[PDB]
């Protein structure tokens with residue numbers, strides 16, 4: 001099959017993912033280069049959803065120039081009926097990659113972490129708080145992690161990465177909580193609260209200071225401190241991203 005985004009023609013190779021009303025495909029242009037096209041159906045879209053879409057796009061377009069850890073958006077076609085986005089094609093999302101591999105290399109992880117701070121830090125600088133980070137939001141492209149979205153436009157639902165303040169009902173400290181959970185999953189093989197099935201009981205645990213989050217002793221003592229810093233329930237007493245980018249775990253060999 002085929003499709004035309006603006007002037008250019010893109011041959012469909014396979015379907016990467018489907019959000020629901022959205023379909024992501026892997027494509028080829030006339031110069032035979034591989035891309036990822038996102039189809040969005042505006043047929044049953046409120047003017048609020050429309051606005052979230054337009055906002056999320058402009059931001060993704062604006063933030064292209066700032067960080068290389070933000071998915072390349074090459075071109076787009078937008079009508080009253082649909083959205084087409086010509087983005088860079090990654091190998092796999094962090095979630096599926098983590099879900100498959102049993103052993104994660106301390107370097108691969110330290111590297112991925114550094115890429116995760118750079119991405120979140122850039123959206124933060126422009127005023128954005130992602131508010132709902134998950135490994136699904138990150139995409140590996142040439143051993144380099146890239147942020148897919150900014151959680152502006154309307155794995156999903158998962159409360160395992162939710163900060164206590166989001167549950168108590170939101171500042172950059174909320175994204176620090178989530179990022180730490182991601183690291184905790186790449187460190188301990190589970191999210192801090194993955195151990196508790198019942199979603200209501202899982203929620204009571206995040207907001208419970210007496211329910212101690214365990215940090216089992218590891219060779220990377222620095223990595224343990226980062227987790228201990230990110231997973232502090234009081235946003236007031238949680239590490240900031242500029243502070244994390246200067247932590248020994250990230251800076252020291």
Ligand SMILES: c1cc2c(cn1)cnc1sccc12
Nearest residue numbers: 036087088089090091092093
């Ligand atoms: C959304 C999702 C992806 C993308 C661009 N937008 C590019 N490559 C890949 S590989 C697995 C998911 C995706």
